[PDB]
């Protein structure tokens, strides 16, 4: 509360670390469904069903231009990529399995890096 400060977690390396995690996700072989925004004009249903589209290139642009206030907002966009993937694809499709694999990959990097 006012004039009563909790001890400050060091956040100075957060930007660099999130960038490294994103690089590792960008270069994963199962990243291909997520590298670019879904083509809303070539994919039936996507625009109406998925209210907040997200993809790795959009996360990268946001990270490079100061649009994440903190590391949790970055993690929210990453998870949104995989949540959107689950909403729209069957678990036993290639894209569906790719999403599950990438989420697992991310969350371990997240835990190892920050937790
Ligand atoms: Cl690139 C692409 N095409 C169709 N559905 C998708 N879900 C996630 N990425 C997708």
Overall structural class, as computed from helix and strand content, comes to mainly alpha
Count the DSSP helices: 5
Largest sheet: none
Task: Examine the secondary-structure arrangement and name the CATH architecture.
Answer: Up-down Bundle
CATH topology: Histone Acetyltransferase, Chain A
Report the count of strand segments: 0
- Domain count: the total is 1
- Shape assignment: elongated
Bound compounds, each kind once, are: 6-chloro-9H-purine
Distance between the termini: 25 Å
Share in helix? 55-70%
Radius of gyration: 16 Å
CATH superfamily: Bromodomain-like
Q: Briefly, what CATH class? A: Mainly Alpha
Strand content: under 5%
- The sequence of SSEs as H and E is HHHHH
């Amino acid at each position: 509360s006012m004039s009563v400060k909790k001890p400050k977690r060091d956040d100075s390396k957060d930007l660099a670390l999130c960038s490294m995690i994103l690089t590792e996700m960008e270069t994963h072989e199962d990243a291909w469904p997520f590298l670019l925004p879904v083509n809303l004009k070539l994919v039936p249903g996507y625009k109406k069903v998925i209210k907040k589209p997200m993809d790795f290139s959009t996360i990268r642009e946001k990270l490079s231009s100061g649009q994440y206030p903190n590391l949790e907002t970055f993690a929210l966009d990453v998870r949104l990529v995989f949540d959107n993937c689950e909403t729209f694809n069957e678990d036993d499709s290639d894209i569906g399995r790719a999403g599950h694999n990438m989420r697992k990959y991310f969350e371990k990097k997240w835990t190892d890096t920050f937790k």
